[PDB]
Design a protein around this ligand. Sequence first.
Ligand code: 0LZ
Ligand code: NAG
Ligand code: NAG
Ligand code: NAG
Ligand code: NAG
Ligand code: NAG
Ligand code: NAG
Ligand code: NAG
Ligand code: NAG
Ligand code: NAG
Ligand code: NAG
Ligand code: NAG
Length: 339
Amino acid sequence: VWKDADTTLFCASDAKAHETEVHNVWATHACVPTDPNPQEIHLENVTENFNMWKNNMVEQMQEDVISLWDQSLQPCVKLTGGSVIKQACPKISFDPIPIHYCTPAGYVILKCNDKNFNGTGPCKNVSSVQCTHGIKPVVSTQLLLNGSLAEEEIIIRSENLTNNAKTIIVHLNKSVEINCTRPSNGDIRKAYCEINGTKWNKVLKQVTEKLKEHFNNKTIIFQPPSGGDLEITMHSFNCRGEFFYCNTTQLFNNTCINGTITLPCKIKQIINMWQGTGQAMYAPPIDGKINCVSNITGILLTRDGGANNTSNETFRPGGGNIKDNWRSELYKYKVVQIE
Ligand SMILES: O=C(NC[C@H]1NCCc2ccccc21)C(=O)Nc1ccc(Cl)c(F)c1
Ligand SMILES: *[C@@H]1O[C@H](CO)[C@@H](O)[C@H](O)[C@H]1NC(C)=O
Ligand SMILES: *[C@@H]1O[C@H](CO)[C@@H](O)[C@H](O)[C@H]1NC(C)=O
Ligand SMILES: *[C@@H]1O[C@H](CO)[C@@H](O)[C@H](O)[C@H]1NC(C)=O
Ligand SMILES: *[C@@H]1O[C@H](CO)[C@@H](O)[C@H](O)[C@H]1NC(C)=O
Ligand SMILES: *[C@@H]1O[C@H](CO)[C@@H](O)[C@H](O)[C@H]1NC(C)=O
Ligand SMILES: *[C@@H]1O[C@H](CO)[C@@H](O)[C@H](O)[C@H]1NC(C)=O
Ligand SMILES: *[C@@H]1O[C@H](CO)[C@@H](O)[C@H](O)[C@H]1NC(C)=O
Ligand SMILES: *[C@@H]1O[C@H](CO)[C@@H](O)[C@H](O)[C@H]1NC(C)=O
Ligand SMILES: *[C@@H]1O[C@H](CO)[C@@H](O)[C@H](O)[C@H]1NC(C)=O
Ligand SMILES: *[C@@H]1O[C@H](CO)[C@@H](O)[C@H](O)[C@H]1NC(C)=O
Ligand SMILES: *[C@@H]1O[C@H](CO)[C@@H](O)[C@H](O)[C@H]1NC(C)=O
């Protein structure tokens, strides 16, 4: 017997104790070795209710990631509660590694194995495990990168689709590589991302179709963000310690629904910290080719309001709350207390 409960989880990884990479260094001092031959008990005739949108596991991982950044990612100047904090801002080795989240004694992690589980409600196929799968603390907006792919069909996730204020998480079932590089040799901040239009449009089309299922076959329209912080209006992400801001206008136009889509990007030193604690300035980009090939595994969308009296539903690429990023990977997990 067991009950839904919250407890201080611990982490496990395969970090190398000799790596200068921030993630490795952190996990080396904050995590333990992974279990080479882990156990998993499949519960037959068991029905458990999940709720990705209200899961303490998310908050905890958020706290870890924040800690990892507070230790190995301090900017030159930090702007917070009216205070100005200045400190060294040396270049570092940056490349996220898988992080497993585990439960201590007396607790276990229930895992939903339903093919098309949307993150909320009852789960038919439930199993018990000590740790989750390896999850990369990849911070980004608009597009989810290097995540996990859905098993069968594309999955739409939301605490409440009827509410436009609630973020939407599109879980892709097929990856779409995005090639981002900052050429060695002008403007040391000019960058770009290449994407196979054929693949992207094919996926985006499938996304629209699935969205129709949840919106009564209403016409699905994509549009670029109305306004706000650059981190939201643009696909922001971190590549090798450098912050990339990419214009995804070409990615979200309802025309191609063929060639290589080239997105205009720029490395920003001044940024609005995702921790939501003001602004911060980092050092200039390093020299040489700055390349990062990532898998687009999910999309963060925001639905426009005031469309109830129209046959259209407008979706725009959003983001900001990194917690949603962790949800897109922890949706199938929940902690329970064993008697
Ligand atoms: O300032 C941010 N959100 C603040 C705020 N924005 C509006 C929406 C929102 C929602 C919840 C919490 C904060 C916010 C932010 O997300 N920054 C950021 C920086 C670097 C990368 Cl790589 C990145 F992906 C994001
Ligand atoms: C997820 O499944 C539950 C249970 O069937 C359902 O109530 C809810 O509407 C679904 N959520 C989405 C986003 O479709
Ligand atoms: C999930 O359960 C259904 C029956 O409810 C079963 O048909 C299906 O094979 C299961 N999915 C998995 C884990 O393969
Ligand atoms: C990139 O996508 C491919 C194809 O799905 C996958 O095999 C590979 O593991 C992905 N790389 C990641 C997630 O880092
Ligand atoms: C992805 O999911 C969609 C349904 O959302 C499905 O039609 C399609 O066959 C899936 N693609 C793959 C590669 O399985
Ligand atoms: C979902 O959101 C809609 C729109 O705000 C709201 O009317 C409704 O009460 C919400 N449903 C739930 C389950 O809270
Ligand atoms: C990524 O794009 C760059 C620039 O076009 C190219 O040189 C490189 O070969 C690409 N990488 C992959 C994995 O295709
Ligand atoms: C683009 O994607 C298609 C499949 O959608 C593939 O057949 C083709 O080889 C890709 N083009 C390039 C430039 O790799
Ligand atoms: C969308 O249209 C199809 C084909 O007519 C129909 O089978 C399905 O019920 C509709 N889906 C809705 C209205 O959610
Ligand atoms: C984003 O970039 C596109 C071109 O890729 C441009 O047309 C558009 O004006 C830009 N949006 C803004 C206002 O940043
Ligand atoms: C839509 O995206 C395609 C990608 O090839 C681009 O060529 C086209 O200019 C875009 N249309 C717009 C921005 O209206
Ligand atoms: C995505 O994964 C690839 C392969 O490990 C890595 O090279 C790249 O840096 C990752 N992208 C991001 C933004 O973390």
